[PDB]
Write a protein that binds this ligand. Structure first.
Ligand SMILES: *[C@@H]1O[C@H](CO)[C@@H](O[C@@H]2O[C@H](CO)[C@@H](O[C@@H]3O[C@H](CO)[C@@H](O)[C@H](O)[C@@H]3O)[C@H](O)[C@H]2NC(C)=O)[C@H](O)[C@H]1NC(C)=O
Ligand SMILES: COc1ccc(C(=O)NCc2cc(C(C)C)no2)cc1OC1CCN(C)CC1
Ligand code: NA
Length: 470
């Protein structure tokens, strides 16, 4: 109620102030005669602390902490079917092991730079379409989820909340660039960590909560929360896991921090330190889900209808932090959830705008452009993309339907091409078109998600080698 609103106002004011202050601090830190790169790659000196904070904050936002508890709470699901915490960590480990050093060693600026140099500028432009939709729909889904969460916590209609959040996210982003985004994520990580880890001890001691050890393997009010994977569901489980594991890498939000580190060796340690952070920040969510599963919602104020019978199972974590915690701590908990839902919007906006500013506007349409023109183009693009994302979140009712399609398209199309450029020699632009056509055809017409990725990958190689033989 009042405590939640007081937390939100303070948190957003602090974030705005830090974002503005970072721009003043770091306006002069860059190549003095190349201002276009200073707002994209950041001057190529970010250490272990700031890098480790921002890389962790990128991957631990969105629906992570609010859908990790829901999977544990809902009967028929459990720890077996909560695959985000393990998918993200394995994706980060694989990235740091195999992809991070080669990309940073060659000193690229954007993810599309490898493609345009070998395949061609036209093919680099064609691969811009799948990425831009993903970056512009992840932000829309995040904005919708934030509105839902805030309308549950307090009563302010979705429009004002989403508009006020999006304006603040865009304002410091266009003013600062990468440095504001990186310096504003330390506050978010500290808020989330402190709130969740101070809330969890108080919830566990409520008289209504039972023993989470006994509930895990024995049924008291509902089915055990460890879960079970049936013999029929093995392949669906593997496909769902592989989507997150092998589809989180080919994103520019990830490659904007791999390419902005001091050296190749410091671009691996950040991934290895973010893999640990993803696991560290997921334990309180699992614990809150287990609490919610073990609780008896008849002595608390929520009333006899259980949250999953009233059809509020997406908001189990706010309900626990509100009803099973004292107000002093509920303040910190609600601030933490509000910080958690908002984490990965600015990174997506900056990632979407940087590629259009560099690869599309500069390198293809207008090569002969000064740095001032490109700076203004980047700022205008940031504003337009933020406005478009907010409008899509508020008006259209098909945000998730398009997010699901774009997520599949990225994993089926972009990932096979990245492997081919980085690790396979002899590839041509005659096989890139074949892969791009074959993946799209199978996705649109008709586990078939992973089989399309292998068909897209294996059609890239055979045609490219065949074209050499003609
Ligand atoms: C949920 O909480 C309620 C309290 O809000 C409790 O319900 C208890 O259930 C007992 C049944 O063992 C009931 O007691 C009976 O009440 C009738 C009148 O309706 C009376 O004629 C009987 O002699 C007997 O006392 C009553 O509904 C209620 N009892 C008390 C003392 O509150 C209980 O804690 C929980 N119930 C469930 C179904 O989860
Ligand atoms: C194929 O790539 C992904 C597939 C699924 C997810 C995922 O988060 N799913 C659960 C979910 C939904 C929601 C709502 C907001 C809609 N919040 O969480 C994320 C994926 O890539 C991200 C990986 C981290 N970073 C690079 C951004 C992209
Ligand atoms: Na961020």
């Amino acid at each position: 109620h009042v405590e939640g609103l007081i937390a939100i106002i303070v948190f957003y004011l602090l974030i705005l102030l830090v974002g503005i202050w970072a721009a003043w601090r770091t306006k002069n830190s860059g190549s003095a005669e190349e201002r276009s790169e200073a707002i994209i790659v950041g001057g190529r000196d970010i250490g272990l602390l700031v890098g480790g904070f921002t890389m962790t904050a990128t991957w631990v936002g969105g629906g992570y902490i609010n859908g990790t508890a829901e999977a544990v709470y809902v009967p028929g699901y459990g720890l077996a079917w909560a695959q985000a915490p393990i998918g993200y960590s394995l994706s980060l480990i694989l990235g740091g092991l195999f992809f991070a050093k080669p990309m940073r060693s060659k000193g690229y600026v954007t993810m599309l730079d490898p493609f345009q140099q070998i395949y061609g500028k036209r093919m680099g432009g064609l691969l811009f379409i799948p990425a831009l939709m993903g970056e512009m729909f992840w932000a829309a889904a995040i904005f919708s989820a934030l509105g839902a969460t805030i309308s549950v916590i307090i009563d302010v209609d979705m429009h004002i909340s989403v508009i006020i959040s999006a304006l603040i996210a865009t304002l410091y982003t266009l003013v600062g660039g990468l440095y504001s985004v990186a310096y504003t994520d330390v506050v978010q990580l500290f808020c989330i960590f402190v709130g969740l880890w101070i809330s969890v001890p108080f919830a566990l001691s409520h008289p209504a909560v039972a023993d989470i050890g006994f509930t895990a393997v024995h049924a008291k009010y509902q089915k055990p929360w460890l879960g079970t994977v049936d013999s029929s569901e093995v392949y669906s489980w593997l496909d769902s896991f592989l989507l997150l594991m092998l589809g989180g890498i080919p994103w520019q939000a990830y490659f904007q921090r791999v390419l902005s580190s001091s050296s190749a060796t410091y671009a691996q340690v950040l991934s290895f330190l973010a893999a640990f952070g993803c696991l560290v920040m997921a334990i309180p969510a699992i614990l809150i889900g287990a609490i919610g599963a073990s609780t008896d919602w008849n002595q608390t104020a929520y009333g006899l209808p259980d949250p999953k019978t009233t059809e509020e199972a997406d908001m189990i974590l706010p309900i626990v932090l509100q009803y099973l915690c004292p107000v002093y701590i509920s303040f910190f908990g609600l601030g933490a959830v509000s910080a958690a839902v908002m984490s990965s919007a600015d990174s997506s906006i900056l990632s979407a705008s940087s590629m259009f500013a560099r690869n599309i506007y500069q390198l293809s349409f207008r090569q002969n452009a000064s740095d001032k023109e490109i700076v203004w183009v980047m700022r205008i693009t940031v504003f337009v993309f933020g406005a478009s994302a907010t409008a899509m979140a508020l008006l259209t009712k098909t945000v998730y339907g398009l997010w699901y399609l774009s997520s599949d398209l990225v994993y089926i199309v972009i990932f096979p091409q990245l492997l081919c450029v980085l690790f396979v020699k002899g590839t041509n632009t005659y096989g890139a078109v074949a892969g791009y056509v074959s993946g799209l055809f199978l996705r649109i017409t008709g586990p078939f998600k992973t089989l399309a990725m292998v068909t897209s990958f294996l059609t890239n190689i055979c045609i490219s080698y065949l074209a050499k033989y003609l």
